Amino acid sequence: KETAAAKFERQHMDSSTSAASSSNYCNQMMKSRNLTKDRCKPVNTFVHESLADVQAVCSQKNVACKNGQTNCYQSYSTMSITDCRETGSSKYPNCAYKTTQANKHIIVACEGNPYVPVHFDASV
Ligand SMILES: [Rh+3]
Ligand SMILES: [Rh+3]
């Protein structure tokens, strides 16, 4: 199938740019990542750092995951991210998102060989 590591890159990595340029960013990117195919995915974070810089988080601050597992890591640095949240009036198939750009620490669950992010837990 799609691997856990590949699903993380599909839902959460957007190295392309250093930040979302425009208010249409989430509408465009949620569609492009298949997150509007069968339903509007309500909440999603994109990280605008290199894959290497995000994979490096798996060697930074070890923390508990929301689910109680201990394979979560917090980035020592802040990272350029975009929070995508579906609007209250958004109706599939016309999925509508508010774009919010921020610099925040990310928290990711890491697994496998190579040891890489497989889940986005939170930003802080
Ligand atoms: Rh997950
Ligand atoms: Rh999952």
UniProtKB/Swiss-Prot annotation:
Annotated GO MF terms: lyase activity; nucleic acid binding; ribonuclease A activity; RNA nuclease activity
Q: Where does it live in the cell?
A: Secreted
Task: Identify the residues that bind substrate.
Answer: K7, R10, K41, P42, V43, N44, T45, K66, R85
Q: What is its main location?
A: secreted
Q: Which residues are glycosylated?
A: K1, K7, N34, K37, K41
> Which tissues carry this protein?
Pancreas.
Question: What keywords appear on the UniProt entry?
Answer: Disulfide bond, Endonuclease, Glycation, Glycoprotein, Hydrolase, Lyase, Nuclease, Secreted, Signal
Has UniProt tagged this entry with the keyword Cytoplasm?
no
Q: Which reaction does it catalyse?
A: an [RNA] containing cytidine + H2O = an [RNA]-3'-cytidine-3'-phosphate + a 5'-hydroxy-ribonucleotide-3'-[RNA]; an [RNA] containing uridine + H2O = an [RNA]-3'-uridine-3'-phosphate + a 5'-hydroxy-ribonucleotide-3'-[RNA]
Q: What is its EC number?
A: 4.6.1.18
Q: Which residues form the active site?
A: H12, H119
Q: Name one GO biological process term.
A: defense response to Gram-positive bacterium
Cellular component GO terms, alphabetical: extracellular region
Intrachain disulfide bonds: C26-C84, C40-C95, C58-C110, C65-C72
What the protein does comes down to: Endonuclease that catalyzes the cleavage of RNA on the 3' side of pyrimidine nucleotides. Acts on single-stranded and double-stranded RNA.
Q: Which family does it belong to?
A: Belongs to the pancreatic ribonuclease family.
Instruction: Please describe the quaternary structure of this protein.
Output: Interacts with and forms tight 1:1 complexes with RNH1. Dimerization of two such complexes may occur. Interaction with RNH1 inhibits this protein. Monomer.
**Name of the molecule in the record:** Ribonuclease pancreatic
Q: What is the lineage of its organism?
A: Eukaryota, Metazoa, Chordata, Craniata, Vertebrata
What gene is this protein a product of? RNASE1
* Residues represented out of the complete protein: 27 to 150 of 150
